Amino acid sequence: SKPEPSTREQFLQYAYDITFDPDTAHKYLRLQEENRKVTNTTPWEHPYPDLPSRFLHWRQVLSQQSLYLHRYYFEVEIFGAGTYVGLTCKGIDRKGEERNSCISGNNFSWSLQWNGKEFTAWYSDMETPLKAGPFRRLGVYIDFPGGILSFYGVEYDTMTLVHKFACKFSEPVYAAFWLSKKENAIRIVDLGE
Ligand SMILES: [Cl-]
């Protein structure tokens, strides 16, 4: 196993293309920019086909890509109180009304919330208030073999650690996004250039 990354340049060696999966998106979420932008447009709903994959209650969407057995890095730009960014497993219950169907409410999902005043780390209904931020751009690092999920505030070439989770990774994971409030928006940064 390599040295852990330190500089933005080192994280960018693990740059991985993420896109939102329209088959998962809650109807109150609009996808744009070739599935690299998601907005909560409540009360404007979008005519997605009914699918078993689609979230019913929670305003969530997953990545098309799964992450399994390597190191990965992607950046997102986030806007609005009530956004969560994290990881989950395919088995997350898409139709569930309970918090076990949201990415802050079960033992196989890990997430970072911006609540309007602070960042908060979530795992299985347990919350950890955090000091760092706010930051409009986050870097999300997944070391699948090393059982690490870490979030950084990115400003120019500076990276400020927001939180580092220790994760017991077994299954493939998906990036997971929850836009709980009207006008919440998340863009996947094109790290291509
Ligand atoms: Cl919601």
Numbering used by the authors: 358 to 550
Give passages from the manuscript.
The tripartite motif (TRIM) proteins form one of the largest subfamilies of RING-type E3 ubiquitin ligases, comprising more than 80 members. TRIM family members typically contain a RING domain usually catalyzing ubiquitin transfer; one or two B-box domains mediating protein–protein interactions; and a large coiled-coil domain region, which is involved in self-association or oligomerization with other TRIM E3-ligase proteins. About two-thirds of human TRIM proteins feature a PRYSPRY domain, also known as the B30.2 domain, in their C-terminal region. All characterized family members shared the same overall PRYSPRY twisted β-sandwich fold consisting of a 7-stranded and a 6-stranded antiparallel β-sheet.
Moreover, TRIM16 has been reported to act as a scaffolding protein that facilitates autophagic degradation of protein aggregates. For the TRIM16 structure, CASTp failed to detect a pocket in the canonical substrate-binding site due to its shallow nature. The binding site generally tends to have a shallow topology, and conventional pocket analysis software failed to detect a sizeable pocket at this site in some cases for TRIM16. This does not, per se, mean that small-molecule ligands cannot be identified, as demonstrated by the recent discovery of ligands for TRIM58. However, developing high-affinity binders is expected to be particularly challenging for those family members.
